[PDB]
A paper describes a structure:
Membrane proteins localize in the lipid bilayer of biomembranes and play a variety of important functions such as transport of various substances between the inside and outside of the cell, signal transduction, energy synthesis, and cell adhesion. Because femtosecond [name] diffraction in [name] is completed on a shorter timescale than the process of radiation damage and photoreduction, this technique captures the damage-free structure of samples.
The structural properties of [name] mimic a phosphatidylcholine structure. [name] can be used as a tool for analyzing lipid-membrane protein interactions. Microcrystals of [name] obtained by the bicelle method were mixed with [name] and then [name] data were collected at [name] (Supplementary Materials Section S7). Although two heavy atom sites were located by the SIR, SIRAS or SAD method, auto-tracing was not possible even with all 18,069 lattices obtained. The [name] molecule adopting alternative conformations binds to an interface region among three symmetry-related [name] molecules. The long alkyl tail of [name] interacts with the hydrophobic transmembrane surface. The aromatic ring in the head group ring is stabilized by π–π stacking with Y26 and hydrophobic interactions of I/Br atoms with L22, G23, V127, and L221 from a [name] molecule and W80 from a neighboring molecule. Because a lipid or detergent molecule is located in the corresponding site of the native [name] structure, we concluded that [name] binds to the same site by partially replacing the lipid or detergent. Thus, we modeled lipid/detergent-derived alkyl chains and [name] together using partial occupancies.
Numbering used by the authors:
A (entry chain A), B (entry chain A): 7 to 230
Write the structure that this text describes.
């Protein structure tokens, strides 16, 4: 498994991010800042677990489509199922989103991850892309609400909060956008980008969307 | 206009690609190889014209949305309107696609470019993304036919033709995929990636999808 090196690097980076966020979060008194630390430390903690499992050869299955037996890391979705709504929750607490908006985004998020996983396991080559399309539409719904909805909510906050939101929103739009493209061209879809390069790409995206995101959030005044 | 440097580089690269393809095409006797040279030389020739126009300050308009006046290079679409179906035509001649398939892809292609252009000029921020979504669906229809349809047609050709098709199909899937993401995150959509970086990205994509593509096609035995 040539991709082990990027699984090992992902594990190391997630583990370091977790440990650092834990040290910093433990030393924080402010009750508001603490919620954000708790949510944000969990994100690389879940990713570290899943990266470790995959490094050790768990969460990989073979799925037949296109006349080959294809390796599918399904453990990625067990990670994303829990880490993606927690990242949304960070953004939603920052702008004081309402309960029904949170529920809509978490629900859409579940649809996005669940249909992605169904698509990843589908044996009919053509139906893989139907699931992928539904997954991407649920994603674009999320991005829409974050871009239009949350930006409007953030503008009623003090400028330091709105500023931090904008940065994190931009990071999120750019980083989340790339995932369905990686899936499309990688071993899950078209089969163009080989599994090792694809693992590198997801690792760079994962670390940036989780540790990178966390660093921007947890170093800002906006959480106090 | 900080983006001038990437417009100038794009012009130079398109011009060099045109000139080189013209020199080589002019020296070719084989009647089949000549069709492919004629179509493929036109692709960077049209791009060079549009890149030159933009460098000299044509094909740029200001479109109001999101409370700002935004610069939109519309000359890109005048290029893509003609260059994208010609690239499809190259692929279709390679695999001997039928007339109705060619007509479907060219039509979908027109929809893709035309709705993209409407989206790029739309003053209501939200409706920009509706046009973008329709444009991307027309694109995904094209990619679907190239991936499933044309691959099946290429498998009935001699292996050297099928091999060349696969490479060009993979280049196309990967390169075309990136365009709607650039538009989404760039000055046309979300406004996250500034115009200069966006111009760099489109220039790299343009040169790769046109000169890169042409180099692979025109250096192969598959056209003789
Ligand atoms: C020992 C068990 C299998 C026992 C039966 C196997 C299953 C997965 C294996 C690891 C991973 O493959 C990644 C990596 C590849 C390197 O090359 C060498 C080290 C490392 C950490 C492997 C060591 C070892 O081989 C493991 C633990
Ligand atoms: C001369 C006319 C305007 C006359 C009225 C303007 C309009 C667009 C201008 C060019 C582009 O801006 C790109 C580039 C910017 C560099 O900085 C200097 C060179 C260059 C090639 C420009 C030269 C010149 O300025 C042009 C031709
Ligand atoms: C190669 C396999 C993985 C293991 C290798 C790990 C690389 C080691 C790098 C450590 C160099 C810096 C020393 C240090 O421990 O802290 C440096 C640096 C400083 O931390 P910090 O202690 O907060 O700074 C205090 C500075 N004063 C002494 C002035 C008070 O910490 C980080 O920025 C950091 C960020 C992440 Br994400 C994770 C971590 I862990 C640290
Ligand atoms: C900086 C602003 C743009 C202007 C700078 C242009 C860069 C100049 C590079 C030329 C170095 C090589 C010399 C040459 O003219 O041909 C080299 C090279 C060789 O061409 P070619 O003549 O086909 O090779 C023949 C070799 N034998 C003599 C053995 C028969 O040509 C290219 O590969 C090429 C590809 C593209 Br796309 C465009 C072009 I034009 C050429
Ligand atoms: C839209 C889409 C996807 C998006 C996944 C996302 C947006 C993942 C983000 C993960 C993070 C932020 C992890 C840490 C998948 C599942 C690849 C399947 C194909 C369609
Ligand atoms: C889908 C989509 C787009 C795709 C454009 C493509 C696929 C361009 C390819 C250009 C080439 C190959 C040029 C040379 C646009 C127009 C950016 C608008 C947004 C939606
Ligand atoms: C050639 C075999 C090397 C085996 C090393 C495997 C364990 C890696 C654990 C991950 C700890 C961080 C280091 C990452 C650098 C490769
Ligand atoms: C004031 C800080 C900048 C505001 C906006 C952030 C720019 C977008 C950042 C996204 C970079 C992610 C790397 C992409 C790797 C594929
Ligand atoms: C016969 C079943 C119909 C399948 C419909 C698929 C539509 C989903 C979008 C297709 C994206 C395909 C891009 C493929 C490039 C490998
Ligand atoms: C600082 C002003 C420089 C002006 C040069 C403008 C003309 C560029 C024409 C393009 C020819 C290829 C060279 C590209 C390298 C910048
Ligand atoms: C035998 C040659 C390789 C077969 C498949 C080609 C791999 C995909 C090439 C696409 C690289 C384009 C660069 C992407 C820049 C964003
Ligand atoms: C009220 C008008 C409805 C608009 C529907 C837009 C759906 C199109 C997909 C949205 C993609 C938005 C991503 C935005 C990230 C900037
Ligand atoms: C108490 C606030 C600091 C961070 C809290 C930790 C939340 C659980 C993550 C522990 C994983 C090792
Ligand atoms: C607050 C408004 C609730 C809207 C309903 C959620 C829609 C789910 C997304 C559709 C994805 C295909
Ligand atoms: C947005 C993702 C960019 C794609 C990176 C392409 C690398 C593919 C190389 C294929 C190796 C054979
Ligand atoms: C005759 C075959 C070689 C290439 C033919 C040229 C097609 C028109 C492009 C001319 C642009 C300068
Ligand atoms: C040969 C079959 C013709 C199919 C009709 C073309 C459909 C256009 C694409 C829809 C994009 C929204
Ligand atoms: C698939 C396209 C990749 C996106 C490249 C991101 C560069 C954005 C930097 C923003 C500068 C402020
Ligand atoms: C084609 C993608 C469909 C995404 C739906 C987004 C609608 C915005 C909510 C009003
Ligand atoms: C959501 C994108 C819709 C694209 C349609 C592709 C259908 C494949 C033709 C049978
Ligand atoms: C959540 C919508 C269900 C649509 C499933 C379509 C299944 C086709 C393979
Ligand atoms: C080609 C389909 C036409 C749909 C246009 C919808 C316009 C909404 C702004
Ligand atoms: C979340 C959708 C699951 C439906 C399962 C269908 C598998 C053939
Ligand atoms: C993506 C890492 C940068 C985080 C530093 C925050 C700047 C105040
Ligand atoms: C190709 C669709 C064009 C329709 C124009 C509508 C502009 C408001
Ligand atoms: C993308 C440029 C490579 C073209 C060389 C063709 C290999 C036979
Ligand atoms: C033909 C099925 C395409 C799925 C589209 C769902 C948004
Ligand atoms: C060769 C493709 C690797 C690109 C990944 C860099 C982030
Ligand atoms: C990736 C962009 C980070 C900028 C940080 C400023 C708060
Ligand atoms: C609500 C409009 C979304 C456009 C989807 C077209 C494929
Ligand atoms: C800083 C972003 C530029 C990346 C473009 C390289 C192809
Ligand atoms: C970008 C991949 C090019 C490989 C060329 C082999 C024909």
């Amino acid at each position: 498994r040539p991709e082990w090196i990027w699984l090992a690097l992902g594990t190391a980076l997630m583990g370091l991010g977790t440990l650092y966020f834990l040290v910093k979060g433990m030393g924080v008194s402010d009750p508001d800042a603490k919620k954000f630390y708790a949510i944000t430390t969990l994100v690389p903690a879940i990713a570290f677990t899943m990266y470790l499992s995959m490094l050790l050869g768990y969460g990989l299955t073979m799925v037949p489509f296109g006349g080959e037996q294809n390796p599918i890391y399904w453990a990625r979705y067990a990670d994303w199922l829990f880490t993606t709504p927690l990242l949304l929750l960070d953004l939603a607490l920052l702008v004081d989103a309402d309960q029904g908006t949170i529920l809509a985004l978490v629900g859409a998020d579940g649809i996005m991850i669940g249909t992605g996983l169904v698509g990843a396991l589908t044996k009919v080559y053509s139906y893989r892309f139907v699931w992928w399309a539904i997954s991407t539409a649920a994603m674009l719904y999320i991005l829409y609400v974050l871009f239009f909805g949350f930006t409007s909510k953030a503008e009623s906050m003090r400028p330091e909060v709105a500023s931090t939101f904008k940065v994190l929103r931009n990071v999120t739009v750019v980083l989340w956008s790339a995932y369905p493209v990686v899936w499309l061209i990688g071993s899950e879809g078209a089969g163009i980008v080989p599994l090792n390069i694809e693992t590198l790409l997801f690792m760079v995206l994962d670390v940036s969307a989780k540790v990178g995101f966390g660093l921007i959030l947890l170093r800002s005044r906006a959480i106090f």
